[model samples]
Target chain A: SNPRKRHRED
Target chain B: GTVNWSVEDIVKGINSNNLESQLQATQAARKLLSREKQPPIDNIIRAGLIPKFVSFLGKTDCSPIQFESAWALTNIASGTSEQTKAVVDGGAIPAFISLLASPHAHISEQAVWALGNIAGDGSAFRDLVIKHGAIDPLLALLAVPDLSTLACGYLRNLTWTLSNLCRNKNPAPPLDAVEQILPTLVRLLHHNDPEVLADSCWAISYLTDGPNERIEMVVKKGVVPQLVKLLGATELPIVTPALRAIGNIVTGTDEQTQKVIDAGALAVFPSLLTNPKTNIQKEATWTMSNITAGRQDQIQQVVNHGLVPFLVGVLSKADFKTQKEAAWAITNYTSGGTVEQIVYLVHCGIIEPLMNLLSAKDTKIIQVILDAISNIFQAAEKLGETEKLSIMIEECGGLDKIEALQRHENESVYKASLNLIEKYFS
Candidate 1:
C-alpha cells in the first residue's frame, strides 16, 4: 500500500 | 589528501588509482550523503565545499570537480529529511541562500532551486529561507524565469511542512517563519511564469486561510488583474490551484466583491455559471454572495447586464434547502431601487406566495399602517399636494387604510389615521 516502498530512510 | 584543497582535488582523489586515496575521497562523498554523518558533512560543506563551489560556479569555465561538488551537495540535500536538518543546524542555510546572489545565472538558478528544495523539506532550513531573506530573491527570480517546475515542486513539499509546523489547531500560523514568508509569496502573483503564477497563487491561498488580511494584500498587489484573466481560461489547463487562489482571495476580503468587479471579474462569474465543476460552483456562489451583499451598486451593474436572469435560471441539484435559498435571494435585487421595486413585480413572480406576507406567518400582520404613515411624511416633505393625494388613493387602498386606522395597536392606529388625513388634504 505504501508507494515510496520503505517507511524509514535507510 | 591534496595539500592545496579544492573540489577538483577531492574529485581527483576519489578517481585516483591508489586504494587508500580513492577510499578516502569516496568516504568523504558518502559521508556527505549519509544521514548520520550529516553534522560532519554540514560543517565541512559550510566551511569548505559551498564557498569553493560558489566561487567556481562564477568562472566562464567550470571544471567537472566544481560540477560534481555542486551536484553532490544538491543530491545530499534534496528530499532527505535528516540531512536538511543537519545543513540547517550547521548554519549552512545562509550560505546556500547567499548562492542566490551569484552573478552566473546557472549558479543563481541552482542556488534558488536548492533553497527551494531545502525549504521544501519544511525543516529549519525553511526558516533559513525567510531568516536569511531569500524570499525577495525568489520573487525577483520568479519575474524573469520559469521557476514553476522547480518552484511548484518545492512549494508543494514546503506546504506540507508548513501545514505540520502550523498544526496546533489555533487557526493562526504558529511560527513567525510562516508569517514572514507570506508577503514574499504574495508578490509571486505578478510573475510572468504561469507555473510561478499558479504556485504563488496556491501558496498565498494556503497560507491566508482563516480570516487573514494578507489575502487582500495579495490580490490587490496594486493589481494581479483578477490575470487570474479569469484563468477560468478559454484554453489554459484547468488549474484547480489557481481557482483555489481566487477563491481564497475573494473569500478572505470584505472588499472582494468590489475588487473582483474592479478587475472585471463579473464576466468571469457569468462564464463560471456554465462551469461543470462542483467546487467551482461553490466558489462562484461565495463570490456571488459577496457581490450581492447590501451594496446595490454592483448588483445593479450585474442586473443591468442581464446577469440576474442567468442567476434566476439556475437551481441546485436536487439540496434545492430549499436552494430556492428562498431563490427569492430575497429577488427582492433588493428592488430597494425605491420602486421600479423592479416592478418587473415579482410580475412573473405572481406576488400572491401569496404577499397575503402569508398576511397569514399566517398573521403577525405586516405594518401596513406604518408604511402608510412614512409615505404620508414623505408626501408632505415633497410639497406636492395634488400628487400626494393621487399617490395615497392609488397605493393605500382607502378601504385598507380605513381598517388600518382602527387597529388595536396604538402606534398602528395613529400612523394609519395620519396617513389618511394627509392623503385627503392633498
Candidate 2:
C-alpha cells in the first residue's frame, strides 16, 4: 500500500 | 534479489525485472506462500508476484492465475503476524494497493476481496492500506455497477477493520486514518443492493466501536427506520446479520436508546414472533438474550401489551438452541411483573420447565427454601384457601397425600407427615 498521504480531501 | 532491501526497493526491482523470466519469478514467488523459511521466499514472491500479476491484469489466461496469486498474497499478508510484516517489508504494498485501479473485472474483484481480507485482519495492512489511497478506490467501487457486491464486502471489512484500527489497545492506527474512513462508509449505506445495504449497515454498526459522533451519525441514517425495516423483512436467505445490525444500531447509543425508542425500533422487535423464519426467531431471541442487551425501559413497555401471549406462543416449536430461548422471553417477562406470572401459568405452557429461578440447578435446598419462600406471600394471599383446598383435592391432594393415606403402606409414613404439615399451614 502507498505511504499515508499526509492529506487527501474527501 | 538476495539483498537486505526495504519494501519499496523490492517493489521497484520486481516491476523493472525482465518480462521473459515471468514464470521463473512466479515459481520463486510460490515459495513465499509457505509457512517455513518465509523471509526470503516472501520477498521473492512479493517482488515477483506484484509486478508479474499486475502486468497480466489485461491478459485473459492470466486472470485466474492473477486472481489466485492476489488471493494468495493477501492470505500471506493477513493470516499470520510475521507474514504481514514480510509483505510490508518487501514493498508489495503499493503494487497491490495500485491494483485497485485495474480495468479487468476479475482482477479488480479479486483485488478488492483480497484487500478486504487483509484489512479485516486489523493487525497488519490497515495503516498501509489506508495510507495508500485504498479508501478512495474502495468507495469508488461502491458506485461501479459490476463491483457492488465485491465492493460492499470489502467496505464492510474495511469499516470494521478501521473500527478496530482506532481502538485496539496494542497497535492502533493513526487518528487521521480512523477519522477519514468512517464517513465514506456512512455514505455506502444508501447503496441500492440489499446485500450491499445489509453489509454496509452492519459495517457502520460495527465501526461506530461502538462509539463515534453521534457516527452512531444517527445510523438513524435519518432512518436506517431501524430500514434495517425490520430487513429482519420483518425473513430471507437469513436474518442473523440484519437482526444484529438493528440490535447494534438501536443499542449502541446508551444515551440514544430512548432516541431509538422514539424512532419506533422498540416496537419493531416484536415482529420476530410473527416472522415465520425460525432462524430469525432464534437470532432475535439470541440477540435479545442477550446482546442488544435491552435497556429501553420497562419499553420491554409491557409489549407484554398485556399479551406480546407469551406469542413467543411457545415459539418454543418450539425453537432450536435450546429457541424455546428457554419461551422461557424467559417467562422470567423480566416477570418482576406484578405475577399474574403472566398466569395464563404459561397456563397454556405445560412444563414450568422450571423457568422460575434458574431453579432447576436444584437450588441448594435453602428453606431461605427459596423463603423469599414462594413469599409472593400471596395477598389474594390465601383469600382463596377454599379455592386452594379444592385445587388440592382435585390435584390428588398434593403428591404426598395420595401416596400416604390412600395407598397406605408402612413406607408411606414420611409422605403422611409431609401431607399433615400442609394441612396445618393451610
Candidate 3:
C-alpha cells in the first residue's frame, strides 16, 4: 500500500 | 541528446569494447537510472547498457564502485517487467553478482541485495539464473556477519526481502539449503518487539514456508510455529495474516510435521480467527482449521470444541461444492479409518444444521455424511424418547420424504435412519 519501502536504501 | 546528446557519449564509452571506459559507462548509466523522474531507461537498454553492466560485474579487476554501479543500475532495470529483467541476468549475472560484490560500505551490500531481490522476484527465468548460480550463500553470509545488526534498517529489510524472494521461486523449487542456511538469522529476526514484524522475522518465515511441502517442513523444524501462533492473536491482519499463511502451509505436511504445528499449540490458539473479518484471512484460517481437524479423529472434536464449529457451519453453507467436495472427504476418510467420531458430537454441539442441509449439495460424499450424522442422532436419542424425541423432529424437518420420494443413495440413507429411529424403540 505504501509502496512497501518509502525509498530504496541506495 | 535524448538519443543523440549525452546518451550517445555514454553509449560510446560502454560499447568501446575496452574494459575501463565500459566501467565508466555503467557509472554514467547508474547515475541516470537513479533519477526519480526521467532517464530514458529503456533507451539505455537499447544502447547495450545491460550487456555492459553484465560484463562489468564479470571482470576480475572490477572495483566496488564498478560492482555498486552495475548492481544499482541492474536493480533499477530489474524493477521493470520480467522480460526486461531477464533481458539481462548477466551472462554470468547470477555467479558474477554474488562474487564481485560485498564491500566495507553497508549501502553497497544493500544495493546489491535490493538489485538481486528485484531479479529474484521478477519471474522464473531470472530466478533460475539467480539460484543455479548459487546466489543464496552470499546473502546469507552478509546477514551472518556480527555487525549486521549495526547496519541501517532498510538494508536489513532488503536482505530479508532478497532471501524470501529466493525461496518463492517457481522453477528449481527454491532450494532447501536456502531455507536451511538462513534459519538461524530467521530466528534472530524474531527477537525484536516490532509490529507486524516479530519485529521482522515473520516476513522471511512466511515467504520460505510458502514454497513446497518439504521446505515448509524445513521452516517448521526451525520451530517458528510457537511464535507465529502467538502472532495469530495480533490485532492487525497485516501481522496476523502472514503468520496464519505460514502455519497453514506448515500443517499440510506429514502427521509428525502437521502434529509439530498442532503440538506447537495451534489447537490451543486462534480458532476464533475463523470468522475474522477479512475473507482472504478468513479463507486461510478456515484452510488452517480444515488441515488440523484433518488430522486424527479426536482432532475433529478438539477443533469444534475450540470455536471452529460455527465457522465450519458457515463454511459449509459457500461450501456447497467444497464442503461436499473437500471438507467431507476429510470428514469421512477419518470415519472410514476407525470408529466414526463426529456426527453426534457435531450435532450435540448444535453444528448439525448446516451439515444436514448439505443434503442440498451435489456430491454424495456430503450427502452421505448427512446420512451418517442423522443416523447417529437417532441412535443418540434412542437411549430415552431419546429415539430421544426422534420421530417428532425427523418428521418435523420434512426428512420424511424418503418414504415419498424416488429412492437414490440419499433416499436409502434416510430409510436406514428411519430404521434406527424405530428398530430400537417402542
Candidate 4:
C-alpha cells in the first residue's frame, strides 16, 4: 500500500 | 478561609533588609499562594513581590530563603497567564534553571516545581525554560544517587517537568533540544515508579506528536519495545500515555509503523480494543487503523491474528468518535489489502458497515470511506469480480448513499463520490 500519514489522537 | 497576613504585610516583610525577615515574608507569600482552594494569586501578583521572590531564588547563601522564594514563584507561575507572565518577566526562568543544580534537594525540587508550572503555562514559556538550558540539569537530577524520600519527590516533580517541557505544539519544541531529550525519556520509560513511567511516556508522546522526523528520532532510540510492553501495564495512567506515544510513532512512515509492529505491540492491541475504558478502546482502534494502513505484510499480521472481526465490531458498535476511528482502520485495510485480504475483510462483514458509513455527516470520514471503497472496487475489478461486489454495494443501499453524497456540502466529498461513481457504477 502507498504510505499514509498515520492518525494521532490527543 | 483566610491567611492572617495581608498581601501588604507579606510584601513589607519581604522588603526588609534582614535576610531572616525576607525568609519569613516569602514563607507567608508561599502559604498565601499555596492554599488548597482559590489561593490569592492575583492579590499576591498585584502586591508586586514577584521580583523579590525572584531575587531570593539566587540567595544560595541561605537555602531557606531560596527555597521559600522558589516555592512562592512556583505557585505564582501556576496562576493565570498574566500572573505567570509576572513571574517570567521577573526573570524567574534563569533563576529556576540555576536551582536545578542545587546540592540541597528541597531547593532543587522547589526549582523543578516552579519550572514545571512555568513550562506548563504555554509554548513560549516552555521553550523559554528549555532555551535557558533546563532540560540537561533537570535530567541530571534523575541520575543522582540519593534514594531518600526527598529524592523520590524530586524525581516525581522532575519527570512532570520534562513532560511539560515536551507538551505543546505548532510550533513544536525546538528540534535540537527535543532530540537531546529523546534519549533520556527512553531511559525514564523503564523507571519503576508509575508516575515516572507515565510522565516519561507522555513526554515522548508529545515529542513525537509532530513531523515524522521526531517519530523517527524516537524509533531510533529504540523506545518502541518499552512503549509496546507498557501497553499491558496494570496501571491505567502508565498504559494510556504509553499507548499514546505508540500511536504517535505509528503515525510516521510505514517503516516506523513496522518498528512498533516488530516490538510485538500487536499482541497487546487486541486486548486494548476490549479495555474497560472507552478512551483506551478508541486509541487502540486508532492505532490499529494506522497499522492496517501500512504495507501488506503488516495488514496480514492484523488479519492473521483474527483482529479484523474486532475492527468490524468497533465499526458497527462503538460511539461515533470511536466508530470513526474503527472506520478508518477498516477502510485503510481495504485500501492496502490484497485481493485475498479484501476477501477476508468482506467475509468479516466489512462491506455493510463500510456502506452504512457512507451516510456519515463528517466529510473527512465520508472521504475516507469513499477512497477505501474505490480501492476495494479496484481490487475486485482485478479479480474479475467487480460486478459481484458492485451488486453487493447496491444491495446494501450504498449506491443510493453514494448518489446522495454527489451533492455533499463539502466539495472533496462530492468529488470523491463522483470519482467512485464514474469509475465503477457508470
lDDT of 1 by residue, B1-426 (tens): 322244455566655666456445544553444344333344445444444434433333433333344444554466357655544554545655665666555555545545555665553445545667766565454453443545454443333333332222243343454555554554455544555455555555555454646555455454346445635555333244555555556555446646656776666766565456655555555445445443556666666655554454443231232223223333324423233323332232322221222121211123432342334334344454445434544453543444444454567555555555555543
Q: For residues B1-426, what per-residue lDDT tens digits would candidate 4 score against the true structure?
A: 224578888988888898988888888887777776677888888788888889899998999999888888887787777888899999999999999889898888888888888888778988888889898898777664442343565777777887887888867888888887776777778778888888888888888798898788788888889998888899999898899999999899999999888888888977888787898999999999999999999999898878998888888777787888988887788878898998878888888888888888888888888877888888888889888787888899999998899998899888888787787786
Q: Give the candidates in order of DockQ, highest first.
A: 3, 1, 2, 4
How high is the lDDT of residue B133 in model 4? 88
- lDDT tens digits, residue span B1-426, model 2: 422444444345445555434433443343344334334534545444544554543344555545545644655554455555554555555655666777666556556655554554553466666777776776665564444455554554443333333332235455456456555545544545555555544454444334445335545345455345535452353244456555555445544444444555445556654456676666555444332234434424434333234333534344444234534344333334344443333344422222232222222211211221132223124444334433433353232332233233333343433443454344
The lDDT for every candidate, in the order shown, is 0.46, 0.45, 0.47, 0.83
Order of the predicted models by TM-score, top scorer first: 4, 3, 2, 1
Better of 3 and 4 by lDDT: 4
Write the candidate numbers in order of decreasing lDDT.
4, 3, 1, 2
DockQ-based CAPRI category assigned to the predicted complex of candidate 3: incorrect
Model 4 alpha-carbon miss at residue B115, Å: 1.2
TM-scores (chain A) of the candidates: 0.22, 0.14, 0.32, 0.20
Superior by DockQ: candidate 2 or candidate 3: 3
For candidate 3, lDDT tens digit of each residue in B1-426?
A: 122236677888877877767666666666666666665666766666665665555454666445645554554544555424544543534534454254544434544444454445444543554555544544554454553364555445444544444344344334554454455545544444343244234444445444356445445555455445544554453345345445445445545335435445445334433434544344444444445445454355444455345445444544344344234433432343223344433343333343454446354554455454454454454344344334544544534433322244556555654564355433
* Candidate 4 Cα RMSD after full superposition onto the native fold (Å): 5.4
Q: Is the docking of candidate 1 incorrect, acceptable, medium or high quality?
A: incorrect
Q: What is the lDDT of residue B353 in candidate 4?
A: 86
Instruction: Give the interface RMSD values of the models in order.
Output: 9.3, 14.4, 5.1, 14.8
Worst lDDT window (10 residues) for model 3 chain B?
A: B332-341
lDDT of candidate 2 at residue B384, scale 0 to 100: 45
Top candidate when judged by lDDT against the true structure: 4
